Symmetry: C3
Protein backbone atom coordinates (compact mmCIF):
# COMPACT_ATOMS: atom_id res chain seq x y z
CA UNK A 1 0.00 0.00 0.00
CA UNK A 2 2.57 2.40 1.42
CA UNK A 3 5.61 0.93 -0.17
CA UNK A 4 8.46 1.62 2.22
CA UNK A 5 7.70 0.84 5.77
CA UNK A 6 9.40 3.00 8.26
CA UNK A 7 9.62 2.62 11.99
CA UNK A 8 10.95 5.11 14.54
CA UNK A 9 12.46 4.20 17.87
CA UNK A 10 12.86 6.86 20.49
CA UNK A 11 15.43 6.18 23.02
CA UNK A 12 15.12 7.88 26.36
CA UNK A 13 14.97 6.94 30.02
CA UNK A 14 12.84 9.99 30.64
CA UNK A 15 10.25 9.27 28.05
CA UNK A 16 10.09 5.55 28.72
CA UNK A 17 9.42 6.13 32.34
CA UNK A 18 6.55 8.40 31.50
CA UNK A 19 8.42 11.28 33.20
CA UNK A 20 8.18 13.51 30.14
CA UNK A 21 7.03 13.63 26.61
CA UNK A 22 8.42 12.83 23.19
CA UNK A 23 9.24 15.87 21.26
CA UNK A 24 11.41 14.41 18.78
CA UNK A 25 9.34 11.40 17.77
CA UNK A 26 6.50 13.41 16.22
CA UNK A 27 8.88 15.71 14.35
CA UNK A 28 10.63 12.77 12.71
CA UNK A 29 7.42 11.07 11.80
CA UNK A 30 6.36 14.19 10.17
CA UNK A 31 9.58 14.72 8.28
CA UNK A 32 9.33 11.20 6.90
CA UNK A 33 5.77 11.81 5.75
CA UNK A 34 6.63 15.09 4.24
CA UNK A 35 9.43 13.34 2.30
CA UNK A 36 7.57 10.35 1.12
CA UNK A 37 7.48 11.42 -2.53
CA UNK A 38 11.23 12.06 -2.73
CA UNK A 39 11.80 8.89 -0.69
CA UNK A 40 10.02 6.83 -3.29
CA UNK A 41 6.80 6.66 -1.29
CA UNK A 42 7.32 5.70 2.32
CA UNK A 43 5.38 5.90 5.47
CA UNK A 44 5.85 5.41 9.17
CA UNK A 45 3.83 2.60 10.47
CA UNK A 46 5.17 2.15 13.86
CA UNK A 47 6.95 3.85 16.73
CA UNK A 48 8.16 2.78 20.07
CA UNK A 49 9.92 4.04 23.06
CA UNK A 50 12.51 2.30 25.08
CA UNK A 51 14.85 3.36 27.85
CA UNK A 52 18.59 3.81 27.54
CA UNK A 53 19.49 0.17 27.91
CA UNK A 54 21.26 -1.81 25.17
CA UNK A 55 19.22 -5.00 25.57
CA UNK A 56 16.03 -3.05 25.27
CA UNK A 57 17.27 -1.45 22.11
CA UNK A 58 18.69 -4.56 20.70
CA UNK A 59 15.39 -6.35 20.93
CA UNK A 60 13.36 -3.84 19.12
CA UNK A 61 15.92 -3.65 16.37
CA UNK A 62 15.94 -7.40 16.09
CA UNK A 63 12.19 -7.65 16.22
CA UNK A 64 11.54 -4.98 13.68
CA UNK A 65 14.11 -6.30 11.20
CA UNK A 66 13.62 -10.06 11.53
CA UNK A 67 9.92 -10.32 12.38
CA UNK A 68 8.08 -7.22 11.14
CA UNK A 69 10.54 -6.72 8.31
CA UNK A 70 10.58 -2.92 8.32
CA UNK A 71 12.51 -1.22 5.47
CA UNK A 72 13.84 1.78 7.31
CA UNK A 73 14.36 2.19 11.04
CA UNK A 74 15.39 5.53 12.50
CA UNK A 75 16.49 5.73 16.19
CA UNK A 76 16.46 9.02 18.08
CA UNK A 77 18.67 9.62 21.07
CA UNK A 78 21.35 8.03 23.12
CA UNK A 79 24.11 8.89 20.66
CA UNK A 80 26.12 11.43 22.70
CA UNK A 81 29.02 11.22 25.25
CA UNK A 82 26.96 10.88 28.40
CA UNK A 83 27.37 7.51 29.95
CA UNK A 84 23.79 6.47 29.46
CA UNK A 85 23.99 7.04 25.76
CA UNK A 86 24.42 3.46 24.41
CA UNK A 87 22.27 3.54 21.31
CA UNK A 88 25.25 3.02 19.02
CA UNK A 89 26.69 0.17 20.97
CA UNK A 90 23.27 -1.49 20.70
CA UNK A 91 23.02 -0.71 17.04
CA UNK A 92 26.53 -2.12 16.26
CA UNK A 93 25.59 -5.42 17.69
CA UNK A 94 22.72 -6.04 15.31
CA UNK A 95 23.69 -4.68 11.98
CA UNK A 96 25.45 -6.93 9.54
CA UNK A 97 26.76 -4.61 6.92
CA UNK A 98 27.92 -1.13 7.77
CA UNK A 99 27.03 1.94 5.68
CA UNK A 100 29.64 4.55 6.56
CA UNK A 101 28.77 6.73 3.73
CA UNK A 102 25.53 7.66 5.39
CA UNK A 103 27.42 8.51 8.58
CA UNK A 104 29.87 10.40 6.65
CA UNK A 105 27.24 12.60 5.07
CA UNK A 106 25.41 13.13 8.35
CA UNK A 107 28.58 14.25 10.04
CA UNK A 108 29.58 16.55 7.20
CA UNK A 109 26.32 18.49 6.89
CA UNK A 110 25.76 18.80 10.65
CA UNK A 111 29.24 20.19 11.11
CA UNK A 112 28.21 23.06 8.89
CA UNK A 113 25.66 24.06 11.37
CA UNK A 114 27.78 23.62 14.43
CA UNK A 115 30.91 22.01 15.74
CA UNK A 116 29.01 20.31 18.54
CA UNK A 117 28.08 17.91 15.80
CA UNK A 118 31.32 16.16 16.47
CA UNK A 119 29.72 14.74 19.53
CA UNK A 120 27.27 12.42 17.73
CA UNK A 121 28.46 8.88 17.89
CA UNK A 122 25.85 7.67 15.54
CA UNK A 123 26.14 4.24 13.93
CA UNK A 124 24.28 2.85 10.92
CA UNK A 125 24.02 -0.28 8.87
CA UNK A 126 21.91 -2.97 7.41
CA UNK A 127 20.32 -5.97 8.99
CA UNK A 128 18.57 -8.47 6.71
CA UNK A 129 16.81 -6.06 4.42
CA UNK A 130 16.36 -3.34 6.99
CA UNK A 131 18.45 -0.18 6.89
CA UNK A 132 18.97 1.21 10.47
CA UNK A 133 20.20 4.76 11.10
CA UNK A 134 20.96 6.29 14.45
CA UNK A 135 19.99 9.94 14.82
CA UNK A 136 20.18 12.47 17.60
CA UNK A 137 17.37 13.30 19.94
CA UNK A 138 16.97 17.03 19.02
CA UNK A 139 13.65 17.73 17.28
CA UNK A 140 15.30 19.73 14.49
CA UNK A 141 17.99 17.09 14.10
CA UNK A 142 15.89 14.69 12.17
CA UNK A 143 14.94 17.43 9.81
CA UNK A 144 18.49 18.43 8.97
CA UNK A 145 19.76 14.82 8.85
CA UNK A 146 16.98 13.80 6.49
CA UNK A 147 17.65 16.75 4.20
CA UNK A 148 21.24 15.50 3.98
CA UNK A 149 20.34 11.93 3.11
CA UNK A 150 17.21 12.34 0.93
CA UNK A 151 19.05 12.70 -2.30
CA UNK A 152 20.10 9.03 -2.09
CA UNK A 153 18.04 7.21 0.50
CA UNK A 154 15.60 6.35 -2.20
CA UNK A 155 18.07 4.49 -4.33
CA UNK A 156 19.41 3.14 -1.04
CA UNK A 157 16.08 1.50 -0.09
CA UNK A 158 15.52 0.21 -3.55
CA UNK A 159 18.91 -1.52 -3.67
CA UNK A 160 18.04 -3.43 -0.46
Amino acid sequence: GPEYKVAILTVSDTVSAGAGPDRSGPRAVSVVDSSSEKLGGAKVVATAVVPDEVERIKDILQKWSDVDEMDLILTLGGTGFTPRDVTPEATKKVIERETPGLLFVMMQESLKITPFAMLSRSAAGIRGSTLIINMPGNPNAVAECMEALLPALKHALKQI
Copy 2:
Protein backbone atom coordinates in the same frame (compact mmCIF):
# COMPACT_ATOMS: atom_id res chain seq x y z
CA GLY B 1 61.94 -5.05 -11.70
CA PRO B 2 58.62 -3.30 -11.28
CA GLU B 3 58.90 -2.06 -7.76
CA TYR B 4 55.34 -1.97 -6.49
CA LYS B 5 53.35 -5.06 -7.26
CA VAL B 6 49.71 -4.45 -7.80
CA ALA B 7 46.92 -6.98 -8.18
CA ILE B 8 43.34 -6.34 -9.15
CA LEU B 9 40.47 -8.49 -8.07
CA THR B 10 37.17 -8.11 -9.83
CA VAL B 11 34.18 -9.13 -7.87
CA SER B 12 31.04 -10.11 -9.76
CA ASP B 13 28.69 -13.06 -10.12
CA THR B 14 27.98 -12.13 -13.69
CA VAL B 15 31.55 -11.84 -14.68
CA SER B 16 32.75 -14.94 -12.85
CA ALA B 17 29.99 -17.13 -14.31
CA GLY B 18 31.13 -16.10 -17.78
CA ALA B 19 27.75 -14.35 -18.45
CA GLY B 20 29.31 -11.07 -19.34
CA PRO B 21 32.58 -9.22 -19.54
CA ASP B 22 34.74 -7.13 -17.36
CA ARG B 23 34.61 -3.62 -18.08
CA SER B 24 36.06 -2.31 -14.92
CA GLY B 25 39.05 -4.53 -14.60
CA PRO B 26 40.83 -3.13 -17.63
CA ARG B 27 40.11 0.53 -16.76
CA ALA B 28 41.63 -0.02 -13.31
CA VAL B 29 44.51 -1.71 -14.83
CA SER B 30 45.38 1.12 -17.09
CA VAL B 31 44.83 3.81 -14.50
CA VAL B 32 47.40 2.08 -12.34
CA ASP B 33 49.85 1.96 -15.29
CA SER B 34 49.23 5.50 -16.27
CA SER B 35 49.90 6.49 -12.56
CA SER B 36 53.07 4.46 -12.13
CA GLU B 37 55.43 7.35 -12.12
CA LYS B 38 53.43 9.24 -9.54
CA LEU B 39 52.98 5.96 -7.58
CA GLY B 40 56.66 5.50 -7.21
CA GLY B 41 56.79 3.09 -10.14
CA ALA B 42 54.10 0.41 -9.87
CA LYS B 43 52.70 -2.19 -12.06
CA VAL B 44 49.83 -4.62 -12.12
CA VAL B 45 51.01 -8.17 -12.26
CA ALA B 46 47.84 -10.05 -11.82
CA THR B 47 44.15 -10.01 -11.93
CA ALA B 48 41.38 -12.35 -11.04
CA VAL B 49 37.66 -12.73 -10.95
CA VAL B 50 35.50 -14.22 -8.24
CA PRO B 51 31.83 -14.23 -7.63
CA ASP B 52 30.08 -12.28 -4.80
CA GLU B 53 30.80 -14.69 -1.96
CA VAL B 54 32.90 -13.85 1.08
CA GLU B 55 34.87 -17.03 1.17
CA ARG B 56 35.89 -16.64 -2.38
CA ILE B 57 37.01 -13.16 -1.67
CA LYS B 58 38.77 -13.78 1.56
CA ASP B 59 40.79 -16.57 -0.04
CA ILE B 60 42.26 -14.46 -2.74
CA LEU B 61 43.01 -11.55 -0.35
CA GLN B 62 44.71 -14.06 1.90
CA LYS B 63 46.64 -15.72 -0.84
CA TRP B 64 47.82 -12.61 -2.55
CA SER B 65 48.77 -11.01 0.74
CA ASP B 66 50.46 -13.90 2.56
CA VAL B 67 51.87 -16.04 -0.32
CA ASP B 68 52.36 -13.81 -3.32
CA GLU B 69 53.11 -10.75 -1.25
CA MET B 70 51.49 -8.12 -3.44
CA ASP B 71 52.03 -4.59 -2.23
CA LEU B 72 48.68 -3.20 -3.40
CA ILE B 73 45.47 -4.95 -4.15
CA LEU B 74 42.46 -3.03 -5.42
CA THR B 75 39.07 -4.78 -5.40
CA LEU B 76 36.31 -3.69 -7.74
CA GLY B 77 32.68 -4.33 -6.98
CA GLY B 78 30.49 -5.73 -4.29
CA THR B 79 30.39 -2.53 -2.29
CA GLY B 80 26.81 -1.28 -2.60
CA PHE B 81 23.55 -1.81 -0.69
CA THR B 82 22.41 -4.82 -2.68
CA PRO B 83 22.27 -8.03 -0.71
CA ARG B 84 24.99 -9.69 -2.70
CA ASP B 85 27.53 -6.90 -2.22
CA VAL B 86 29.76 -8.48 0.41
CA THR B 87 33.14 -7.33 -0.53
CA PRO B 88 33.62 -5.04 2.42
CA GLU B 89 32.54 -7.73 4.81
CA ALA B 90 35.07 -9.98 3.30
CA THR B 91 37.79 -7.44 3.37
CA LYS B 92 37.16 -6.57 7.00
CA LYS B 93 37.85 -10.12 7.99
CA VAL B 94 41.32 -10.14 6.51
CA ILE B 95 42.85 -6.86 7.19
CA GLU B 96 44.82 -6.22 10.34
CA ARG B 97 45.18 -2.48 10.43
CA GLU B 98 42.59 -0.02 9.21
CA THR B 99 43.33 3.00 7.14
CA PRO B 100 40.29 5.11 7.49
CA GLY B 101 42.12 7.99 6.13
CA LEU B 102 41.93 6.55 2.69
CA LEU B 103 38.20 5.94 3.01
CA PHE B 104 37.66 9.40 4.17
CA VAL B 105 39.39 10.76 1.20
CA MET B 106 37.57 8.50 -1.26
CA MET B 107 34.24 9.42 0.19
CA GLN B 108 34.95 13.14 0.14
CA GLU B 109 36.04 13.48 -3.39
CA SER B 110 33.44 11.22 -4.78
CA LEU B 111 30.64 13.08 -2.92
CA LYS B 112 31.66 16.09 -5.00
CA ILE B 113 30.65 14.42 -8.09
CA THR B 114 27.37 12.99 -6.78
CA PRO B 115 25.44 12.20 -3.66
CA PHE B 116 25.06 8.62 -4.73
CA ALA B 117 28.57 8.26 -3.45
CA MET B 118 27.23 7.85 0.07
CA LEU B 119 26.28 4.38 -1.09
CA SER B 120 29.80 2.81 -1.10
CA ARG B 121 30.51 0.65 1.89
CA SER B 122 34.05 0.40 0.92
CA ALA B 123 36.63 -0.91 3.31
CA ALA B 124 40.39 -0.74 3.39
CA GLY B 125 43.41 -1.46 5.44
CA ILE B 126 46.58 -3.43 5.70
CA ARG B 127 47.39 -7.07 5.94
CA GLY B 128 51.03 -8.20 6.45
CA SER B 129 52.61 -5.70 4.15
CA THR B 130 49.82 -5.54 1.64
CA LEU B 131 47.63 -2.45 1.33
CA ILE B 132 44.01 -3.39 0.37
CA ILE B 133 41.46 -0.92 -0.93
CA ASN B 134 37.92 -1.68 -2.03
CA MET B 135 36.58 0.30 -4.96
CA PRO B 136 33.36 0.41 -6.82
CA GLY B 137 32.41 -1.55 -9.89
CA ASN B 138 31.93 1.49 -12.27
CA PRO B 139 34.68 1.88 -14.85
CA ASN B 140 35.17 5.61 -14.24
CA ALA B 141 35.12 4.96 -10.50
CA VAL B 142 38.68 3.72 -10.39
CA ALA B 143 39.84 6.76 -12.31
CA GLU B 144 38.35 9.24 -9.85
CA CYS B 145 39.23 7.24 -6.72
CA MET B 146 42.81 7.00 -7.79
CA GLU B 147 43.02 10.75 -8.55
CA ALA B 148 41.93 11.31 -5.00
CA LEU B 149 44.57 9.03 -3.46
CA LEU B 150 47.71 9.45 -5.64
CA PRO B 151 49.01 12.41 -3.79
CA ALA B 152 49.81 10.08 -0.86
CA LEU B 153 49.60 6.49 -1.92
CA LYS B 154 53.27 6.64 -2.75
CA HIS B 155 54.40 7.65 0.68
CA ALA B 156 51.79 5.05 1.83
CA LEU B 157 53.39 2.06 0.03
CA LYS B 158 56.80 3.13 1.02
CA GLN B 159 55.92 3.33 4.74
CA ILE B 160 54.70 -0.28 4.52
Copy 3:
Protein backbone atom coordinates in the same frame (compact mmCIF):
# COMPACT_ATOMS: atom_id res chain seq x y z
CA GLY C 1 41.90 21.60 42.08
CA PRO C 2 42.53 21.37 38.36
CA GLU C 3 39.23 20.15 37.09
CA TYR C 4 40.01 18.19 33.98
CA LYS C 5 42.80 15.69 34.47
CA VAL C 6 44.89 15.18 31.37
CA ALA C 7 47.55 12.60 30.65
CA ILE C 8 49.88 12.24 27.74
CA LEU C 9 51.36 9.02 26.48
CA THR C 10 54.28 9.27 24.07
CA VAL C 11 54.56 6.27 21.96
CA SER C 12 57.90 5.66 20.45
CA ASP C 13 60.60 2.94 20.31
CA THR C 14 63.32 5.47 20.03
CA VAL C 15 62.29 7.54 22.91
CA SER C 16 61.49 4.72 25.27
CA ALA C 17 64.91 3.15 24.75
CA GLY C 18 66.76 6.33 25.68
CA ALA C 19 68.04 6.82 22.12
CA GLY C 20 66.63 10.20 21.31
CA PRO C 21 64.37 12.69 23.07
CA ASP C 22 60.78 13.62 23.09
CA ARG C 23 59.91 16.63 21.16
CA SER C 24 56.27 16.06 20.87
CA GLY C 25 55.41 15.33 24.46
CA PRO C 26 56.27 18.85 25.51
CA ARG C 27 54.47 20.66 22.77
CA ALA C 28 51.33 18.68 23.55
CA VAL C 29 51.83 19.58 27.01
CA SER C 30 51.88 23.21 26.47
CA VAL C 31 49.05 23.23 23.99
CA VAL C 32 46.79 21.72 26.56
CA ASP C 33 47.88 24.24 29.22
CA SER C 34 47.51 27.05 26.80
CA SER C 35 43.89 25.81 26.10
CA SER C 36 42.82 25.27 29.68
CA GLU C 37 40.36 28.11 29.75
CA LYS C 38 38.63 27.15 26.55
CA LEU C 39 38.78 23.57 27.69
CA GLY C 40 36.88 24.29 30.86
CA GLY C 41 40.00 24.37 33.03
CA ALA C 42 42.24 21.43 32.41
CA LYS C 43 45.71 20.53 33.13
CA VAL C 44 48.21 17.88 32.30
CA VAL C 45 49.12 15.84 35.32
CA ALA C 46 51.12 12.95 33.98
CA THR C 47 53.05 11.77 31.06
CA ALA C 48 54.81 8.60 30.10
CA VAL C 49 56.68 6.93 27.38
CA VAL C 50 56.34 3.46 26.07
CA PRO C 51 57.63 1.75 22.99
CA ASP C 52 55.75 0.63 19.95
CA GLU C 53 54.13 -2.49 21.37
CA VAL C 54 50.36 -3.07 21.92
CA GLU C 55 50.68 -4.60 25.36
CA ARG C 56 52.73 -1.73 26.56
CA ILE C 57 50.16 0.71 25.22
CA LYS C 58 47.13 -1.21 26.42
CA ASP C 59 48.37 -1.39 29.98
CA ILE C 60 48.88 2.31 30.31
CA LEU C 61 45.57 2.99 28.66
CA GLN C 62 43.96 0.63 31.13
CA LYS C 63 45.80 1.88 34.08
CA TRP C 64 45.22 5.54 33.58
CA SER C 65 41.61 4.94 32.87
CA ASP C 66 40.63 2.36 35.45
CA VAL C 67 42.88 3.29 38.32
CA ASP C 68 44.04 6.87 37.99
CA GLU C 69 40.80 7.94 36.46
CA MET C 70 42.14 10.49 34.02
CA ASP C 71 39.46 12.41 32.11
CA LEU C 72 41.45 12.93 28.91
CA ILE C 73 44.37 10.88 27.59
CA LEU C 74 46.16 12.00 24.46
CA THR C 75 48.59 9.54 22.82
CA LEU C 76 51.30 10.62 20.43
CA GLY C 77 52.75 8.48 17.71
CA GLY C 78 52.44 5.11 16.17
CA THR C 79 49.51 6.01 14.02
CA GLY C 80 51.04 5.74 10.52
CA PHE C 81 51.46 2.95 7.92
CA THR C 82 54.85 1.71 9.08
CA PRO C 83 54.61 -1.76 10.55
CA ARG C 84 55.57 -0.74 14.00
CA ASP C 85 52.81 1.83 14.26
CA VAL C 86 50.31 -0.03 16.38
CA THR C 87 48.86 2.61 18.55
CA PRO C 88 45.42 2.51 17.05
CA GLU C 89 45.24 -1.20 17.26
CA ALA C 90 46.01 -0.89 20.94
CA THR C 91 43.67 1.86 21.49
CA LYS C 92 40.80 -0.04 19.80
CA LYS C 93 41.07 -2.87 22.24
CA VAL C 94 40.53 -0.72 25.25
CA ILE C 95 37.87 1.61 24.34
CA GLU C 96 34.22 0.89 24.86
CA ARG C 97 32.41 3.53 22.92
CA GLU C 98 33.79 5.04 19.76
CA THR C 99 33.69 8.67 18.99
CA PRO C 100 34.10 8.92 15.24
CA GLY C 101 33.06 12.45 15.12
CA LEU C 102 36.32 13.50 16.70
CA LEU C 103 38.22 11.42 14.07
CA PHE C 104 36.15 12.95 11.52
CA VAL C 105 37.00 16.48 12.44
CA MET C 106 40.67 15.85 12.93
CA MET C 107 40.88 14.23 9.57
CA GLN C 108 38.98 17.01 7.84
CA GLU C 109 41.09 19.90 9.25
CA SER C 110 44.45 18.26 8.66
CA LEU C 111 43.54 17.42 5.12
CA LYS C 112 43.31 21.12 4.56
CA ILE C 113 46.91 21.43 5.35
CA THR C 114 48.13 18.48 3.44
CA PRO C 115 47.04 15.30 1.75
CA PHE C 116 49.45 13.25 3.73
CA ALA C 117 46.92 13.59 6.46
CA MET C 118 45.25 10.63 4.89
CA LEU C 119 47.87 8.52 6.45
CA SER C 120 46.82 8.86 10.11
CA ARG C 121 45.04 5.71 11.30
CA SER C 122 44.09 7.33 14.46
CA ALA C 123 41.53 5.88 16.70
CA ALA C 124 39.60 7.39 19.55
CA GLY C 125 36.98 6.58 22.10
CA ILE C 126 35.72 6.42 25.62
CA ARG C 127 36.62 3.99 28.30
CA GLY C 128 34.83 4.32 31.67
CA SER C 129 34.75 8.02 32.05
CA THR C 130 38.05 8.65 30.21
CA LEU C 131 38.16 10.10 26.64
CA ILE C 132 41.16 8.76 24.65
CA ILE C 133 42.39 10.33 21.41
CA ASN C 134 45.26 9.15 19.30
CA MET C 135 47.38 11.89 17.79
CA PRO C 136 50.25 12.00 15.36
CA GLY C 137 53.80 12.10 16.61
CA ASN C 138 54.76 15.51 14.93
CA PRO C 139 55.17 18.42 17.32
CA ASN C 140 52.94 20.78 15.38
CA ALA C 141 50.39 18.06 14.96
CA VAL C 142 49.01 18.41 18.46
CA ALA C 143 48.63 22.10 18.02
CA GLU C 144 46.57 21.72 14.86
CA CYS C 145 44.54 18.74 16.08
CA MET C 146 43.61 20.57 19.21
CA GLU C 147 42.59 23.68 17.33
CA ALA C 148 40.17 21.51 15.45
CA LEU C 149 38.67 19.97 18.58
CA LEU C 150 38.65 22.83 21.07
CA PRO C 151 35.34 24.21 20.08
CA ALA C 152 33.66 21.07 21.49
CA LEU C 153 36.01 19.13 23.63
CA LYS C 154 34.78 21.13 26.54
CA HIS C 155 31.17 20.04 26.16
CA ALA C 156 32.70 16.67 25.45
CA LEU C 157 34.41 16.26 28.81
CA LYS C 158 31.52 17.73 30.70
CA GLN C 159 29.08 15.15 29.22
CA ILE C 160 31.32 12.27 30.42
